[PDB]
Design an enzyme around this catalytic site. Structure first.
Site, mmCIF file in Angstrom:
data_model
loop_
_atom_site.group_PDB
_atom_site.id
_atom_site.type_symbol
_atom_site.label_atom_id
_atom_site.label_comp_id
_atom_site.label_asym_id
_atom_site.label_seq_id
_atom_site.Cartn_x
_atom_site.Cartn_y
_atom_site.Cartn_z
ATOM 1 N N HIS A 43 -44.771 65.835 1.796
ATOM 2 C CA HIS A 43 -46.169 66.316 1.417
ATOM 3 C C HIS A 43 -46.724 66.793 2.529
ATOM 4 C CE1 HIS A 43 -48.577 63.511 3.728
ATOM 5 N NE2 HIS A 43 -47.963 62.350 3.064
ATOM 6 N N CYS A 45 -49.697 58.804 9.137
ATOM 7 C CA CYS A 45 -48.729 59.191 8.188
ATOM 8 C C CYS A 45 -47.446 59.621 8.631
ATOM 9 C CB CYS A 45 -49.305 60.515 7.390
ATOM 10 S SG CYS A 45 -48.453 61.196 5.901
ATOM 11 N N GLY A 94 -52.585 61.456 10.160
ATOM 12 C CA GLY A 94 -51.737 61.538 11.374
ATOM 13 C C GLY A 94 -50.701 60.532 11.647
#
Length: 182
Positions: A35, A139, A137
């Protein structure tokens, strides 16, 4: 928590467009949540396949420290993006990808833009979510076990859920539970 030195040397930063998150650098491949290739207006009904075709290699900015790793290919495996780079990580540890279950513990190296800031012992709840501290982040942070001198990567964080709980995949890109990157 497991000592994090083997994994720290693999953490990198991946940027695509507006989006920046953590990547995992093993051999000549960087793994990160796919993503990353979405501006989140795409996040409603993304066509990843159309999106990945639309990207070219220079669209991907990969940096480990203040080295740039030049991307020389990009493919996708379920929900993880696999960026081929022009150099193999000379700090690649012995490693394997494994799939685990809720209740089994693992350590997670929280990073903010390729930069490690903590290591924490976690487990997924029976609904496959995990409650901790990891925002924008963080992430792309990964989780692992160390068995002897081998790093078993078992988790990659992908998204914070409305409830605040977090969802993620294994390193083969298969989400744990029914979550989707949409």
């Amino acid at each position: 928590a497991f000592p994090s030195g083997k994994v720290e040397g693999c953490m990198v930063q991946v940027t695509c467009g507006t989006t920046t998150l953590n990547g995992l650098w093993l051999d000549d491949v960087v793994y990160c949540p796919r993503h990353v290739i979405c501006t989140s207006e795409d996040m409603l009904n993304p066509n990843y396949e159309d999106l990945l075709i639309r990207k070219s290699n220079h669209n991907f900015l990969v940096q480990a420290g203040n080295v740039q790793l030049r991307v020389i290919g990009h493919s996708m495996q379920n929900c993880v993006l696999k960026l081929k780079v022009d150099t193999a990580n000379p700090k690649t540890p012995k490693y394997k990808f494994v799939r685990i279950q809720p209740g089994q513990t693992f350590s997670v190296l929280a990073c903010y833009n390729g930069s490690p800031s903590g290591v924490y012992q976690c487990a997924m709840r029976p609904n496959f979510t995990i409650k901790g501290s990891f925002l924008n982040g963080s992430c792309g942070s990964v989780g692992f076990n160390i068995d002897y001198d081998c790093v078993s990567f078992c988790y990659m964080h992908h998204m914070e859920l409305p409830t605040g709980v977090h969802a993620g995949t294994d390193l083969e890109g298969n989400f744990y539970g029914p979550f989707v990157d949409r």
